Design a protein that fits this description.
It is classed as viral protein. This is part of a larger assembly, with 1 copy of chain A, 1 copy of chain B and 4 copies of chain C. By secondary structure, chain A is low in regular secondary structure. Chain A has no helices and 2 strands. Chain A has a two-stranded parallel sheet with strand order 1-2. Chain A starts with 8 loop residues before the first strand and ends in a 26-residue tail after the last strand. Helix content of chain A is about 0%, strand content about 10%. In chain B, about 30% of the residues lie in helices and about 5% in strands. In chain B, a hairpin with a 4-residue loop joins β1 (about 80) and β2 (about 85-90). In chain B, α3 runs antiparallel to α4 (about 110-125). Chain B is globular. In chain C, about 0% of the residues lie in helices and about 50% in strands. Chain C contains no helices and 8 strands. Chain C has strands at about 15-25, 30-45, 50-55, 60-65, 65, 80, 85-90, 105. The chains are: A little secondary structure, B mainly alpha, C mainly beta. The interface of E and F includes residues 11 and 60 of E.
Chain lengths: ~50, ~130, ~110, ~110, ~110, ~110
């Protein structure tokens, strides 16, 4: 149920009854990285670890 | 017949264990008249014990039906059936169905009736004088 | 004097009917399926094109289908547990003049 | 001595026939469907491929079809209310030599 | 008094049933098929569309299929050695009310 | 007392069976088909969809097919010379319980 529109929105491939006569459905078609290489690498020390 | 055999056919014929009032009081009272002391000791108990069961099984089950309420006042035989697409065929029973009587009582329907018949012919020869 | 379903009683077996009532959706859009009710019941199952093998690249799996002819009332989306596995109902052909239906069952476990 | 439709009387049921007359179009181009007339009537309905489940991405819905064999005159676009739901008529096969028809019904509610 | 499978005894033949249990995967991703168990058994084989020639560019090879109707229990992925060649089971139609099944066999050797 | 193939004797005809054994390949990659063995034999030929005309752009040619039902053993790739022309075997349905087969024949000459 989106905040912008006033209707009910549901996930793509479920196994439930159709909710109402007006409603929406969102599916994930694909995704991918956008640039060929990285921007940065963030290094961080684990909290309370030890490598021996 | 000093003792009307009661509540014992449930032990003799294990299949009948549903109801006991309809058997002892309603039916056994209708059979213990046919037995006579002119019989043999080995027959007076088993013969009535068999005839009561024949009378019971004539109806659906000890009282008028089994646990499902699917009983037929006419004992229509089932000749064939098919369940890949439900179908049944029955017999025709109006006066006498097939090699059966139309003016007497047919004792040769079930096995219990045949047992009663085989004892009856043994102990009761038929001849009169009057 | 009418009795047709008396034919379904010749061959039958105890399968667990599993009647279903729908749910609703979480405010985040997900789904919640609930409200099952179980009951032992008698059916007459026959293997109309059952257990077709499938040797996919992912491996091996079977494709099982069945027909029911049961006396009770079963909707189009219920479950029937038979032989230790669950089956989902494809399609029913109810005959309310009599008491029985006809159902297509497909095995659920992949 | 002729009576064939006497067979349709063995099995029948009260369905509400809903006869339709067309409308016209508003000057803005829209459509106005009106002029229904209702009448209780007797039919002989059978489930020829009824209640096929469809698990679409949008959810779950069924696909119901039926046949009628009714004695009254029913056109190709009318309605028949049966078992609490409306059905629209696909196609009729009238037999004016006798009095009866044959109708295909599809459930309307999505 | 019931005996239907008594029909399968009129025509029969000794084929070697080869029951299968699955394996697992090597840590490098390969597959290991093992656990065969052999048993001589009697079947009633018939040539339903057997030995179809195929003259491919690669050469000549045949396409053999068969049906079984055997009394023992055979799953969907087993082997049956008949006439000196192995056959793999397509699909079975078990009838547990009786004792027998119905099986589709395809020849393995290319 | 069993005799079924006694039916194939009512109608029969002398066709020349031509049994085949395969060859191998020349070191340059070509093929060498050899090892034919001929034998006069009796069959029961019937014209199941024979002599279909084909008016291709290249001209006119026919498409001939036949069925055999012969008592002898014929494999899937042999030849049968009948009515002066050769026919190649599509597919056989042997019935080893009896002695006979069933064969599809297609004319070779283009």
């Amino acid at each position: 149920m989106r905040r912008i529109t006033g209707i009910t929105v549901i996930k793509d491939h479920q196994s439930e009854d159709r909710p109402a006569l007006p409603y929406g459905v969102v599916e994930l078609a694909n995704f991918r990285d956008l640039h060929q290489q990285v921007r940065t690498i963030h290094y961080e020390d684990i909290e309370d670890s030890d490598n021996g | 017949n000093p003792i009307p055999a009661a509540s014992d056919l449930k032990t003799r014929y294990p299949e009948f264990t549903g109801v006991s009032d309809a058997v002892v009081n309603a039916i056994i009272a209708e059979v213990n008249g046919m037995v006579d002391d002119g019989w043999e000791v080995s027959d007076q108990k088993p013969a009535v014990l068999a005839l009561a069961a024949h009378m019971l099984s004539r109806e659906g089950y000890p009282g008028r039906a089994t646990n499902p309420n699917s009983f037929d006042p006419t004992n229509r035989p089932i000749l064939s059936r098919k369940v890949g697409d439900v179908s049944t065929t029955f017999g025709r029973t109006d006066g006498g169905a097939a090699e059966g009587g139309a003016n007497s009582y047919n004792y040769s329907s079930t096995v219990y009736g045949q047992t009663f018949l085989r004892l009856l012919r043994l102990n009761a020869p038929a001849v009169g004088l009057v | 004097m009418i009795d047709v379903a008396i034919a379904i009683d010749a061959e039958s077996v105890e399968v667990t009917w599993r009647n279903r009532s729908g749910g609703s959706y979480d405010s985040r859009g997900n789904a919640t399926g609930a409200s099952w009710a179980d009951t032992q019941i008698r059916a007459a199952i026959q293997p109309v094109s059952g257990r077709e093998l499938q040797d996919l690249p992912e491996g091996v799996r079977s494709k099982v289908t069945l027909v029911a002819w049961t006396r009770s009332e079963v909707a189009e989306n219920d479950q029937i547990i038979y032989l230790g596995d669950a089956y989902r109902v494809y399609a029913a052909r109810p005959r309310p003049m009599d008491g029985f239906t006809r159902i297509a069952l497909g095995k659920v476990s992949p």
